[PDB]
Design a protein around this ligand. Structure first.
Ligand SMILES: CC1(C)CO[C@@H](CNC(=O)N2CCN(C(=O)c3cccc(O)c3)CC2)CO1
Length: 121
């Protein structure tokens, strides 16, 4: 497909699948802080899947690369705060990241192909 706009609904559907994954439970809403009062002493830019979905629906992503950067930020934040590899949260982040990356690859490739087609002549 050379549809330049198709990534948005593809990302909406992928976020729906991520919300149905039990493994997204730790990452659905902005970090509390009452449970992690030193979170901002480690994490510069909090990110969660609800914030990514609201940013998409507001029309405040221009490309799927920008959405992908924020989703990758969720997993880097979780790694930056994980006190060890043998943490349930860390194992949840790795599985959900693998699922995300498996599904976002086509969405990025199709978008970049469509833009190249748009500027072909
Ligand atoms: C001592 C405690 C209270 C520690 O917390 C429980 C296990 N969970 C974590 O350690 N997390 C830190 C890592 N996370 C995040 O960076 C994150 C990312 C996006 C949104 C979001 O809301 C958090 C998730 C939660 C177990 O008991």
């Amino acid at each position: 497909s050379y549809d330049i706009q198709a990534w948005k609904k593809q990302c909406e559907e992928l976020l729906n699948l991520i919300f149905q994954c039990e493994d997204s439970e730790p990452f659905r809403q902005p970090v509390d802080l009452l449970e992690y009062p030193d979170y901002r002493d480690i994490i510069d830019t909090p990110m969660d899947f609800a914030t990514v979905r609201e940013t998409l629906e507001a029309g405040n992503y221009e490309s799927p690369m920008e959405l992908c950067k924020d989703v990758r930020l969720i997993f880097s934040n979780s790694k930056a705060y994980t006190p060890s590899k043998r943490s349930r949260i860390y194992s949840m982040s790795l599985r959900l990241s693998a699922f995300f990356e498996e599904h976002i690859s086509s969405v990025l490739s199709d978008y970049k192909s469509a833009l190249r087609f748009h500027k072909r002549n």
